[PDB]
Design an enzyme around this catalytic site. Sequence first.
Site, short mmCIF file in Angstrom:
data_model
loop_
_atom_site.label_atom_id
_atom_site.label_comp_id
_atom_site.label_asym_id
_atom_site.label_seq_id
_atom_site.Cartn_x
_atom_site.Cartn_y
_atom_site.Cartn_z
N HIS A 121 1.05 39.82 -83.25
CA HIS A 121 0.68 39.71 -81.86
C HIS A 121 0.49 38.31 -81.35
CE1 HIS A 121 -0.94 40.46 -78.00
NE2 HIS A 121 -2.18 40.19 -78.35
N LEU A 163 2.66 46.72 -77.04
CA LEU A 163 1.19 46.77 -77.03
C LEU A 163 0.58 47.90 -76.24
CD1 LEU A 163 -1.41 45.42 -77.87
CD2 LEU A 163 -1.26 44.03 -75.86
N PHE A 181 -14.29 43.00 -73.33
CA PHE A 181 -13.12 42.76 -74.13
C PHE A 181 -13.49 42.05 -75.41
CE2 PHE A 181 -8.51 42.59 -73.93
CZ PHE A 181 -8.36 43.78 -73.21
N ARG A 233 -11.75 44.02 -84.41
CA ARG A 233 -10.31 44.10 -84.46
C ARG A 233 -9.72 44.18 -85.88
NH1 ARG A 233 -7.95 40.25 -81.51
NH2 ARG A 233 -8.96 38.67 -82.84
N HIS A 245 -2.42 43.15 -83.57
CA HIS A 245 -3.12 44.05 -82.68
C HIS A 245 -3.11 45.41 -83.33
CE1 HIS A 245 -4.16 46.10 -78.89
NE2 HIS A 245 -4.64 44.91 -78.58
N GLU A 268 -6.17 47.18 -75.54
CA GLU A 268 -7.51 47.55 -75.96
C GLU A 268 -8.18 48.45 -74.91
OE1 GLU A 268 -9.92 44.32 -77.66
OE2 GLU A 268 -11.62 45.04 -76.50
N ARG A 324 -8.55 34.27 -82.59
CA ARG A 324 -8.74 34.22 -81.18
C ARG A 324 -9.61 35.38 -80.68
NH1 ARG A 324 -6.36 36.41 -76.52
NH2 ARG A 324 -4.83 37.54 -77.82
N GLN A 362 -2.69 36.67 -85.53
CA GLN A 362 -3.42 37.84 -85.06
C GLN A 362 -2.54 39.09 -84.96
OE1 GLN A 362 -5.30 38.46 -80.82
NE2 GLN A 362 -6.61 37.34 -82.29
C1 LIG Z 1 1.89 42.07 -74.81
C2 LIG Z 1 0.89 40.92 -74.81
C3 LIG Z 1 -0.33 41.00 -74.13
C4 LIG Z 1 -1.23 39.92 -74.13
N1 LIG Z 1 -2.43 40.06 -73.48
C5 LIG Z 1 -3.38 39.07 -73.40
C6 LIG Z 1 -4.59 39.25 -72.67
O1 LIG Z 1 -4.80 40.33 -72.10
N2 LIG Z 1 -5.53 38.26 -72.59
C7 LIG Z 1 -5.32 37.08 -73.22
O2 LIG Z 1 -6.21 36.20 -73.12
N3 LIG Z 1 -4.14 36.88 -73.90
C8 LIG Z 1 -3.16 37.84 -74.03
N4 LIG Z 1 -1.94 37.66 -74.76
C9 LIG Z 1 -1.70 36.36 -75.40
C10 LIG Z 1 -1.32 35.32 -74.34
O3 LIG Z 1 -0.62 35.98 -73.30
C11 LIG Z 1 -0.35 34.25 -74.76
O4 LIG Z 1 -1.09 33.69 -75.83
C12 LIG Z 1 -0.12 33.24 -73.64
O5 LIG Z 1 0.46 33.87 -72.50
C13 LIG Z 1 0.87 32.14 -73.97
O6 LIG Z 1 1.30 31.51 -72.76
P1 LIG Z 1 1.95 30.05 -72.88
O7 LIG Z 1 1.74 29.19 -71.66
O8 LIG Z 1 1.48 29.40 -74.14
O9 LIG Z 1 3.56 30.18 -73.00
P2 LIG Z 1 4.52 31.41 -72.74
O10 LIG Z 1 3.98 32.27 -71.70
O11 LIG Z 1 4.78 32.06 -74.05
O12 LIG Z 1 5.76 30.69 -72.07
C14 LIG Z 1 6.46 29.77 -72.86
C15 LIG Z 1 7.54 29.04 -72.06
O13 LIG Z 1 8.22 28.22 -72.99
C16 LIG Z 1 9.56 28.17 -72.57
N5 LIG Z 1 10.39 27.87 -73.74
C17 LIG Z 1 10.28 28.32 -74.99
N6 LIG Z 1 11.23 27.73 -75.78
C18 LIG Z 1 11.91 26.86 -74.98
C19 LIG Z 1 12.96 25.95 -75.17
N7 LIG Z 1 13.57 25.78 -76.37
N8 LIG Z 1 13.40 25.22 -74.13
C20 LIG Z 1 12.85 25.36 -72.89
N9 LIG Z 1 11.84 26.20 -72.66
C21 LIG Z 1 11.37 26.96 -73.69
C22 LIG Z 1 9.91 29.70 -72.10
O14 LIG Z 1 10.92 29.74 -71.48
C23 LIG Z 1 8.56 29.89 -71.26
O15 LIG Z 1 8.75 29.56 -69.83
C24 LIG Z 1 -0.95 38.71 -74.79
C25 LIG Z 1 0.29 38.61 -75.46
C26 LIG Z 1 1.17 39.71 -75.47
C27 LIG Z 1 2.46 39.62 -76.23
O1 LIG Z 2 -5.03 43.69 -73.76
C1 LIG Z 2 -5.00 43.71 -75.00
O2 LIG Z 2 -5.22 44.75 -75.62
C2 LIG Z 2 -4.70 42.49 -75.83
C3 LIG Z 2 -5.61 41.32 -75.49
C4 LIG Z 2 -5.36 40.07 -75.95
O3 LIG Z 2 -4.36 39.90 -76.67
O4 LIG Z 2 -6.10 39.09 -75.65
#
Ligand SMILES: Cc1cc2nc3c(=O)[nH]c(=O)nc-3n(C[C@H](O)[C@H](O)[C@H](O)COP(=O)(O)OP(=O)(O)OC[C@H]3O[C@@H](n4cnc5c(N)ncnc54)[C@H](O)[C@@H]3O)c2cc1C
Ligand SMILES: O=C(O)/C=C/C(=O)O
Lengths: 119, 130, 243, 577
Positions: free
Chosen positions: D356, D243, D117, D288, D233, D246, D391, D231
């Site tokens: 993204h 999405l 990846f 990327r 995608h 990849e 990232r 970032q």
């Molecule tokens: C489609 C997609 C695929 C991805 N794939 C990957 C991957 O394969 N590998 C990788 O390493 N990363 C990936 N990422 C990036 C990564 O998933 C995120 O960066 C990461 O999950 C963020 O998690 P988090 O704990 O920061 O918060 P989040 O998972 O974003 O959760 C945030 C929390 O905050 C709470 N919240 C927000 N505002 C409030 C408020 N005002 N009051 C109370 N609660 C609130 C929400 O309710 C939630 O429970 C992906 C992102 C996307 C969109």
């Molecule tokens: O699974 C993906 O393509 C995206 C990966 C990532 O955001 O880290």
Amino acid sequence: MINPNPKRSDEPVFWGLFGAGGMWSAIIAPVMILLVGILLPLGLFPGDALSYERVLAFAQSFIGRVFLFLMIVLPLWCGLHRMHHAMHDLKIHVPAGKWVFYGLAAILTVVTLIGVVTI
Amino acid sequence: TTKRKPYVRPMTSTWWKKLPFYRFYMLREGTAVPAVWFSIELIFGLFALKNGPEAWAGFVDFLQNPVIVIINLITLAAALLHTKTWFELAPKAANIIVKDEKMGPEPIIKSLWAVTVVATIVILFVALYW
Amino acid sequence: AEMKNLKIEVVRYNPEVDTAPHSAFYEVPYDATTSLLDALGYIKDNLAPDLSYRWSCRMAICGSCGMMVNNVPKLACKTFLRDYTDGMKVEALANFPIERDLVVDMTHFIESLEAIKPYIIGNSRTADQGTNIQTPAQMAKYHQFSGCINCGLCYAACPQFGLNPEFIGPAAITLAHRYNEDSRDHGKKERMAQLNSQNGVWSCTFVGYCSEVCPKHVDPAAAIQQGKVESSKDFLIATLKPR
Amino acid sequence: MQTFQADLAIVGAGGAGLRAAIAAAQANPNAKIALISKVYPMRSHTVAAEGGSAAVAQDHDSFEYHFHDTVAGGDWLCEQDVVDYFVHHCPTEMTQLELWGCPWSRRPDGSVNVRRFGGMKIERTWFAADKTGFHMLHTLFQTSLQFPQIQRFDEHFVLDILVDDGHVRGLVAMNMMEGTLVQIRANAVVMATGGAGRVYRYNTNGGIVTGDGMGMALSHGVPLRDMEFVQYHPTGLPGSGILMTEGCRGEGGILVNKNGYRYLQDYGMGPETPLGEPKNKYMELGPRDKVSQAFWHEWRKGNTISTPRGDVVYLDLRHLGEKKLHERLPFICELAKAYVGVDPVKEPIPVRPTAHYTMGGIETDQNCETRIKGLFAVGECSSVGLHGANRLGSNSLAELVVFGRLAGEQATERAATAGNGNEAAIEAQAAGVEQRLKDLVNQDGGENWAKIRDEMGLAMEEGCGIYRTPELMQKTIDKLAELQERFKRVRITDTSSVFNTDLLYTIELGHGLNVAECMAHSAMARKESRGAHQRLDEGCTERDDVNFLKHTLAFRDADGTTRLEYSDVKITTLPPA
Ligand SMILES: Cc1cc2nc3c(=O)[nH]c(=O)nc-3n(C[C@H](O)[C@H](O)[C@H](O)COP(=O)(O)OP(=O)(O)OC[C@H]3O[C@@H](n4cnc5c(N)ncnc54)[C@H](O)[C@@H]3O)c2cc1C
Ligand SMILES: O=C(O)/C=C/C(=O)O
Ligand code: F3S
Ligand code: FES
């Protein structure tokens, strides 16, 4: 919310019977209904195959005694467990339905038993 | 004092008429009735058979009643229906792994049908060929 | 181009103002890519800002968009207007209390999931020892049953949950079953009492519809029946334990 | 307001937030932890992730390679002592999740598998099949259920934090169903609210990733750091922006224009590789940024296929055949089939680059602590110093559990040693939120928030995208300040109290505006190109280490202005040249 120390349902017991019963009616009931209900009365059987005299011979054999018992008894258990629940699904309140339906099943089972030990 | 006034929709006994998928389930569960009825008839048989040719023949005359015949066709139709659904339902009760995959039911359904077929045949042979 | 409109009827319900829910009607433009969720947002944006509903992901993975559509449980984000040219009636997820518009009280669901203790129990392995060993075959035991996005379409679909609201339900049972079937879990004893209950697997009459609607193809019906077998093994063993 | 008292309060129940709760529960069995979330924990964007989580597991890999990939991937804007802590703790946390029940994909011997990846040389990404985020999240959520220390406040929208005399004393939140205000008092607070990708018109994110958490920090004089690095995608569906992992390209799908030309060999990523045999760093497995930029180039040239939803290139997976699709990429296939209407088996998926991930976020030290004592940040809403300008693919999931853990423990210590604050001052703070809230409800003007939303999203796409110019950045800056004005003239017509979303959505839009401004400002001032921040203007098209090897810090003053300062970037063993 959800009861912490909920009581073990007795349901495994009836459902087991109903499993054995259901499989039996699935595999064997169709040919039986066919013979008894369709061939016999329409005389659509060769010769004297389903003659009073021939039945009795089978009925009164040990194998027949068991086979007839199970043919009758197992489908009742499957059958009535299903009707027990159909009341609930249909929203019909029957008092001691558990007692009614399984009671009926037990009455019949015993009768049938009596029959296959002969009268 | 909450301002929430949770509206709880009612569940009536006509509920299963709605969806065609519910209807069929009721139907599948309907097979139970004629199943139990055939068990009833068999008991009369066991006993008219017990009480001699007099009764046994009055029994055969009963089955020979044109309405009892129709009930019984239906009865066997029900049975096939039951058989048909039993073989689809039953397999979901097993969890068999073949070569790192969870097997589907199709293999099982095929067997239950094959064994049903044989059985149906062997009984007819036994019942009728002598 | 000119976009065809669609008259969608959404069943509204304010508890401050309403005696019972009642249907409003909205004209929504659409093309071949327009999901109910798209249209819901559109209503809200330009016609009824007081339209309240749950959602997030838009790709049917967070499991939040669940509602009735022409009487079938669906994810709004995966339901498309093109597929409903004759009419579309949108109601709150069935078998749950309507709090407001298309928002319902998930508590029992939540409470139910919690009740079966869905977590590894009694493995003592520690991280410094590295991971458990689990083979592709060992996983294949529960893997599908682990695909639950907790939508609750199962609960709307289950006539048994409708009739008996204390039924812990397809998902919850599936989830217990998923942990029970994990080679790495040693906590089956701790989830059994719930499943053995009459509000456990034994409320299911195998209607099967749950699994028809699972947008994630979890097949909760299969987990329940497999649960009945386990419940039934359990009952027997209990019967033979004189100790 | 009803007042709740807890040792720790965590805002956000995604991967990072849940992991902080569990750590906090384990660090002290006695503690009352308030786990707050505007949605139920399983709905968080963490759930949508599919590529995987990075942790050195292979014998040939080293922690120095993961460390190196990360710093270089970050164009050197990373905090190297943070990256060091991160790589070393990664194996521990992916193992702990496996202990907790995470169904990582396994080798025949039953050991966990890894896949490549983010252009890393040595494979090190654990994957739970095609649903790695789903699994990480639900595993963490479910594991959290066993600990009675965590008292969740599900569907509670946090409005503000309370800070007195340089310390955070709690927060005020709305019970969204009841429409009522609550006040949790806690001497440590962790923000774990996710990124801000919904300030963009087209993105991959849930509706809930609106930057609420980053906004609150701005409110109190904490700067957001490195906000210009957003970032993109390369492969997202048109319109929806959903999405396409990849992995499609790891599985060897190809990207092609209207002429079916695999255009990337002409943007430095040649030569073409055979359909069967995909090479890392080459073609579709190229860098990327280069791939996204490539799409832009192809677009200028008139090589992009035009659709109703927009201009696209095609992602061709046809030569994978039905079997290959199912075992490794079933979800993509459902998504394609559903959202664009394309059976990947018979057809090519239209793809467009889409916003993204948020590299920027609330500035934190190495313990995840901010300049407000006791106030903490973790996850995508933060800036630990891990990702610099870019990232690494699969580094964000790993960080959630690595730093979510750190934060949980650190917050627990800070709570243990806090000692009391000035009560009148704290409730004065609390009344302030409530007052300020009524203000926004009574606010009048007839602006539809939805249009401001829309208009914001547009200015972000246009002026803050893949390539950047000073005209468009300025236009975006200007648009945004106009939107801030209009925001004061928004009438929130629904006055309901029971799940009133018009009002919550309106609050989130307010946070968005603040945040976007930080982003747009950060980028305009960064006269260089580095990572995700690529500019076309004369004397800004290259990286600048004489002048730009420092983090942008964005503060927002009471007067409504976005001010920037600069911080130095920590180097341990890996300088640039
Ligand atoms: C489609 C997609 C695929 C991805 N794939 C990957 C991957 O394969 N590998 C990788 O390493 N990363 C990936 N990422 C990036 C990564 O998933 C995120 O960066 C990461 O999950 C963020 O998690 P988090 O704990 O920061 O918060 P989040 O998972 O974003 O959760 C945030 C929390 O905050 C709470 N919240 C927000 N505002 C409030 C408020 N005002 N009051 C109370 N609660 C609130 C929400 O309710 C939630 O429970 C992906 C992102 C996307 C969109
Ligand atoms: O699974 C993906 O393509 C995206 C990966 C990532 O955001 O880290
Ligand atoms: S619909 Fe209900 S009856 Fe069982 S098969 Fe599903 S839980
Ligand atoms: S929004 Fe996530 S399930 Fe539809």
